[PDB]
Design a protein around this ligand. Structure first.
Ligand code: BCL
Ligand code: BCL
Ligand code: BCL
Ligand code: BCL
Ligand code: BCL
Ligand code: BCL
Ligand code: BCL
Ligand code: BCL
Ligand code: HEM
Ligand SMILES: CC(C)=CCC\C(C)=C/C=C\C(C)=C\C=C\C(C)=C\C=C\C=C(C)\C=C\C=C(C)\C=C\C1=C(C)C(=O)CCC1(C)C
Lengths: 32, 35, 49, 291, 57, 38, 49, 38, 38, 38
């Protein structure tokens, strides 16, 4: 109940974190 | 990329094994390590 | 990159193929051990009851 | 889908294995503390008790507890006196003639117990009758301040006071109608504010709830929550306890309690309406607020 | 002054990254405070009892 | 190289060391073995 | 180069092979010692009980 | 060629020193040996 | 050429000094020697 | 050329000064000598 939904919302917070990492790794790769 | 798949796979598997091992230990329902 | 069969040729390089073999073998072994360990944890004390 | 499936498997695992949630302890007298296993009360003593109840109608030579019968007295003693302290039944009683002290029937304890009874009655009558409606009629008794322990209780344990300095104690040598106020005073510096925040965090850990329990953090000098008035009464009560009973003119002279300040935590023990506090109607008339 | 020059392309990357990271950590902190942590002083209670120094006092 | 060999050995030795340390600390703190005055 | 067998030629360099050998030997030794230590910790006091 | 030797010796002598120090601290603070007034 | 001698002497004289200082402070603070009013 | 002399004298005088200062602070704060009202 409370904890299932809480974990699922924490998933979304980490997904918000996600794009910045893709930016960093793209810069690392495409700049040899 | 294949390596992204294997990286995320191991990480998720390791985290999941660790979380299940912690939950089962802390539940106190198995008489394991003085319980 | 011609060691992989034709059906999977677009996807896999040559080097990727062997690591993929290693991964499949490891996964099969791990699944066998996991099944054995669960049968043992069940014989000890069942969890569903 | 692998992620959500794994999360579901994990939660099923957890629900299955996890031991069930706990129901709150229900006891007819106390709010959250019970005395259930009476193995600590010896059994040969319990047999002798029945005799004294059945033999005599009234208790000979009771100084306090004036409107009770020997049976009521015996039941009250086994339920709250032996129950609060978890002592032996003979811990301050003799097999017979236990009205007085002869032959050291664990002498010098019965009189301290009588004085504790008096002090509890006085606290209950002077301070615990304030804004009674909507607060409840809970009343202080033996289980409070003793929590199943005869002696050696600590009013400041090590677990609380993680952020505070260990030398620090609640400062009870102040008028406390508003002596701790600090806002906008212009004759106090950051040192006074630091002492204030120490005391406030202590009140926070004592009470189960958080810091917005009684303050309305937009303006701290405001009195709109009305859970502060209760705290003013409790502060005057704690100061009165310390000044009158812990150290009346020095701990050595005419002091009981062995010089232990009340500390606001040994009573509440992590929750408002402490668990040792007796439910309304479960305390002798003399000991209660309305006698 | 300070013995390092980041370059022209370097400073703009760093600006973008720091700006983006601040708000992410912030929203994490608030969501966590609401759901799992009641007070923050109790969180740091574990540090004192680290085995290396739990008994030297 | 589909995987640089040295990345594998680095991650392997880090994971192994962390895992040994964690298990050791859990076993010591469980207090079920009578080891170092227990 | 060319010291590694043909089946693993696309993956391993020459230098990477000897390190590997060292790694495999160390892992085998460590596993033997781990098994011995576990048998000893069991004979002392069992943990499952 | 796959590994610089000096990186290995650097990490080895750092890990060994840290590990000796940590074990020495833990054993001293456990208070189970009667060493330096215990 | 690979291993500079001066790096070795620098790290040696730093580690030795730190180690002497740490041992001196631990022994003084243990209070087991009756040294400087103890 | 391998060892600049001035680096040696700089580090020497810095270390010596710091060490003298630290020892005098420790001795003063120990309160075991009756020096400056003690
Ligand atoms: C007696 C049984 C206990 C129990 C406790 C556990 C514990 C503890 C675990 C599981 C785990 C699993 N359990 Mg269970 N399990 C129980 C009840 C259940 C029930 C149920 C009643 O319905 C179900 C459906 C499951 C289902 C599952 C599977 C989903 C999962 C393992 C499969 C896997 O991923 O592949 C197989 C396993 C792998 C992940 C792949 C193999 C990887 C290789 C082998 C890695 C091993 C390398 C090794 C660590 C290092 C080697 C040394 C080198 C020298 C460095 N469990 C009861 C409570 N369960 C395991 C897990 O993985 O959780 C994800 C886990 O550890
Ligand atoms: C509670 C009752 C039982 C219990 C019930 C079970 C059950 C049931 C199971 C386990 C499983 C296992 N238990 Mg258990 N377990 C118990 C107590 C223990 C104890 C101990 C302290 O007592 C230990 C050490 C373990 C340990 C283990 C492992 C043997 C295994 C989990 C494998 C896994 O998670 O890793 C998997 C890790 C990953 C997925 C990644 C592995 C990393 C690879 C191998 C390293 C190479 C990486 C490579 C270089 C690429 C690098 C990639 C980078 C990461 C990016 N259990 C108690 C006694 N345990 C599970 C298992 O055996 O299934 C195999 C199993 O199903
Ligand atoms: C006693 C109170 C606590 C306190 C409690 C909180 C709480 C509670 C929070 C913060 C949060 C923040 N606090 Mg704090 N904070 C305190 C003390 C401080 C101090 C300080 C020096 O003491 C500082 C620097 C900060 C700094 C900050 C950052 C950590 C963070 C900023 C919010 C933000 O970035 O996202 C805010 C982002 C948005 C909401 C902006 C959304 C805007 C949208 C997209 C634009 C709408 C368009 C708008 C209509 C305009 C239209 C344009 C047309 C012209 C009209 N706090 C004190 C100690 N702090 C907040 C945070 O975590 O962020 C989640 C928060 O939750
Ligand atoms: C006494 C029994 C305790 C317990 C206490 C421990 C402790 C403590 C440890 C383990 C460790 C392990 N346990 Mg056990 N373990 C228990 C119950 C279990 C159970 C169970 C019943 O289900 C399982 C499945 C396991 C399984 C395992 C493996 C996961 C793991 C080591 C396997 C391996 O060989 O190492 C894999 C291979 C190696 C480690 C290679 C070693 C590499 C070289 C040899 C290291 C040398 C280090 C050297 C000193 C450094 C200096 C060398 C320089 C050259 C000088 N344990 C019970 C609870 N277990 C060990 C762990 O994993 O740590 C890594 C660990 O320390
Ligand atoms: C609880 C009951 C027993 C106990 C039960 C067990 C059991 C059972 C086991 C151990 C194991 C070990 N225990 Mg124990 N252990 C106990 C108490 C102790 C005490 C002590 C304070 O009392 C100590 C010091 C130890 C120490 C150890 C090590 C000897 C060993 C773990 C090896 C490992 O993890 O490293 C492995 C480290 C890594 C994987 C990396 C190693 C690093 C390499 C060697 C350094 C060179 C790196 C190279 C330069 C490349 C650099 C790479 C960089 C990282 C990038 N135990 C108690 C008494 N212990 C385990 C062991 O022996 O198996 C071998 C074992 O199975
Ligand atoms: C009294 C017994 C205590 C205990 C206290 C300690 C303490 C304390 C220590 C260890 C250390 C170790 N213990 Mg023990 N240990 C115990 C029980 C155990 C158990 C167990 C029963 O299971 C195990 C397996 C171990 C195993 C180990 C190894 C992991 C480790 C050292 C191995 C080695 O030779 O060093 C590997 C090789 C070396 C260290 C090379 C040394 C390099 C050179 C010689 C260093 C010289 C330093 C010099 C002074 C600097 C100046 C020189 C300049 C030239 C002048 N201990 C019990 C609890 N153990 C030691 C540790 O690891 O620290 C490193 C450590 O200090
Ligand atoms: C009284 C006993 C106390 C104790 C107190 C101390 C104190 C205090 C110290 C040590 C130090 C050391 N102790 Mg001890 N030590 C104890 C128990 C132990 C035990 C144990 C029983 O297990 C061990 C193994 C050791 C081992 C050691 C070595 C690790 C170390 C010095 C070794 C060496 O020769 O120096 C290595 C070589 C040298 C230091 C080279 C010296 C270089 C030149 C000579 C320095 C000259 C300085 C000069 C004054 C500067 C001006 C000169 C200008 C030219 C004018 N001690 C007990 C607890 N031990 C010493 C330390 O390491 O500090 C360095 C330290 O000060
Ligand atoms: C009273 C005894 C106190 C104590 C108090 C102090 C104090 C205080 C000091 C020392 C200092 C020293 N002590 Mg002692 N010390 C004690 C016990 C000990 C013990 C012990 C029993 O084990 C030892 C081994 C030592 C050993 C030492 C040396 C490490 C050190 C100075 C050695 C040297 O000659 O200087 C090395 C060589 C020199 C310092 C060169 C000096 C350079 C020139 C002459 C400096 C001139 C400065 C001038 C004023 C600046 C203006 C000049 C312009 C031209 C005008 N002490 C007890 C506890 N000890 C001194 C320290 O190290 O500070 C440097 C320090 O001040
Ligand atoms: C019941 C109302 C009640 C009794 C009865 C009672 C008795 C009692 C005894 C016998 C002691 C001394 C035990 C010893 O061997 O010395 C004792 C000591 C303390 N008490 Fe008490 N007490 C009763 C009630 C209360 C209440 C409500 C409080 C709360 C303030 C309280 C407090 C104390 C304190 C403090 C002590 C001293 C503990 C110590 O360490 O010295 N008692 N009580
Ligand atoms: C708290 C506790 C108990 C700690 C325990 C651990 C302890 C106490 C010590 C540990 C280690 C020790 C003993 C360190 C000691 C270091 C010393 C003494 C360094 C040298 C100093 C000698 C010095 C600086 C001499 C320097 C040379 C100088 C000043 C020359 C200066 C000059 C310069 C450079 C010029 O332009 C020309 C003029 C002149 C030549 C005079």
């Amino acid at each position: 109940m409370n904890w299932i939904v809480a974990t699922f919302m924490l998933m979304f917070v980490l997904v918000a974190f996600l794009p910045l990492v893709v930016s960093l790794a793209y810069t690392w790769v495409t700049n040899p | 990329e294949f390596r992204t798949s294997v990286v995320v796979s191991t990480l998720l598997g390791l985290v999941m094994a660790l979380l299940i091992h912690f939950v089962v230990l802390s539940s106190g329902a198995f008489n394991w390590l003085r319980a | 990159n011609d060691l992989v069969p034709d059906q999977w040729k677009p996807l896999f390089n040559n080097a990727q193929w062997l690591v993929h073999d290693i991964v499949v073998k490891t996964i099969y072994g791990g699944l066998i051990i996991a099944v054995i360990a669960h049968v043992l944890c069940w014989a000890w004390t069942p969890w569903i009851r | 889908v692998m992620a959500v499936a794994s999360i579901a498997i994990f939660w099923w695992i957890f629900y299955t294995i996890t031991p069930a949630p706990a129901p709150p302890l229900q006891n007819p007298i106390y709010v959250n503390y019970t005395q259930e296993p009476t193995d600590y009360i010896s059994a040969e003593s319990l047999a002798a008790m029945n005799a004294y109840i059945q033999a005599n109608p009234q208790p000979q030579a009771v100084q306090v507890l004036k409107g009770m019968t020997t049976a009521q007295i015996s039941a009250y003693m086994v339920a709250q006196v032996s129950g609060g302290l978890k002592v032996d039944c003979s811990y301050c009683h003799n097999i017979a003639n236990f009205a007085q002290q002869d032959g050291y029937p664990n002498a010098a304890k019965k009189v301290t117990a009588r004085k504790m009874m008096l002090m509890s009655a006085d606290l209950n009558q002077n301070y615990t009758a304030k804004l009674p409606a909507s607060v409840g009629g809970y009343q202080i008794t033996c289980a409070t301040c003793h929590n199943g322990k005869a002696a050696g209780l600590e009013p400041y344990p090590i677990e609380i006071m993680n952020t505070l300095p260990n030398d620090w104690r609640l400062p009870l040598e102040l008028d406390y109608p508003g002596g701790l106020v600090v806002t906008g005073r212009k004759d106090v510096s950051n040192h006074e504010v630091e002492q204030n925040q120490f005391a406030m965090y202590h009140m926070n850990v004592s009470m189960g709830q958080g810091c917005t329990f009684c303050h309305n953090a937009r303006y701290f000098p405001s009195y709109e929550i009305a859970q502060k008035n209760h705290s003013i009464i409790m502060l005057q009560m704690t100061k009165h306890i310390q000044e009158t009973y812990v150290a009346p003119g020095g701990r050595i002279a005419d002091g009981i309690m062995a010089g232990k300040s009340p500390s606001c935590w040994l009573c509440h023990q992590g929750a408002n309406i402490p668990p040792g506090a007796a439910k309304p109607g479960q305390v002798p008339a003399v000991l209660s607020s309305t006698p | 002054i300070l013995g390092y020059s980041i370059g022209e392309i370097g400073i703009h990357r760093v600006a973008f990254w720091t700006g983006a990271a601040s708000v992410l950590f912030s929203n994490l902190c608030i969501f966590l405070s609401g759901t799992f942590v009641k007070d923050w002083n109790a969180f740091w209670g574990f540090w004192d009892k680290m085995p290396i120094w739990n008994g030297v006092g």
